[PDB]
Amino acid sequence: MASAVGEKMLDDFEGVLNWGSYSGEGAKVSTKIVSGKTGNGMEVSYTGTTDGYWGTVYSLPDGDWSKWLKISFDIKSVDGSANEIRFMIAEKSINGVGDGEHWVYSITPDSSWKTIEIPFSSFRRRLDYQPPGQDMSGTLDLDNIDSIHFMYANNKSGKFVVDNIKLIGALE
Ligand SMILES: [Ca+2]
Ligand SMILES: [Ca+2]
């Protein structure tokens, strides 16, 4: 139901596809529109390897979501299994150049379209690698978000698919 509960839309694909793709070392990416949980969805196909890299990216219309508690998507593994991800979010630079801090998940879907509400208290840093104009607040700042990033935690050739990408408020 609209305008009655504490959720706000990030992307439900009813426009033009703004998302990134890239690869190397024998892996591949293909992003395309499909049918989803309301109107259209998005599917993403891959080849995967072990020592390579394969990726898809989004830049947000809002990055100032301190009052919100969770992300949500309705998502499945359409590779032939149920495969996991180590996916990433960037904080804004305190020098106004590059990025400010890097923060990540470890999570898995299944083979069917479940809603996956994940809170801000899920995360840890990207621990090899951080910016020169950095934040050191000891935490992720939802006040201060720049961009979001796919990262590999499986080596499959296969697919994944979504609709309904949102922010969710508290449960009080
Ligand atoms: Ca949709
Ligand atoms: Ca921070």
UniProtKB/Swiss-Prot annotation:
Residues 4-170 form the CBM11 domain. It comes from the Bacteria. In the N-terminal section; belongs to the glycosyl hydrolase 5 (cellulase A) family. In the C-terminal section; belongs to the glycosyl hydrolase 26 family. This enzyme catalyzes the endohydrolysis of 1,4-beta-glucosidic linkages in cellulose, lichenin and cereal beta-D-glucans. This is Endoglucanase H. It comes from Acetivibrio thermocellus (strain ATCC 27405 / DSM 1237 / JCM 9322 / NBRC 103400 / NCIMB 10682 / NRRL B-4536 / VPI 7372). The lineage of its organism: Bacteria, Bacillati, Bacillota, Clostridia, Eubacteriales. The gene is celH. The chain holds residues 655 to 821 of 900 of the full protein.
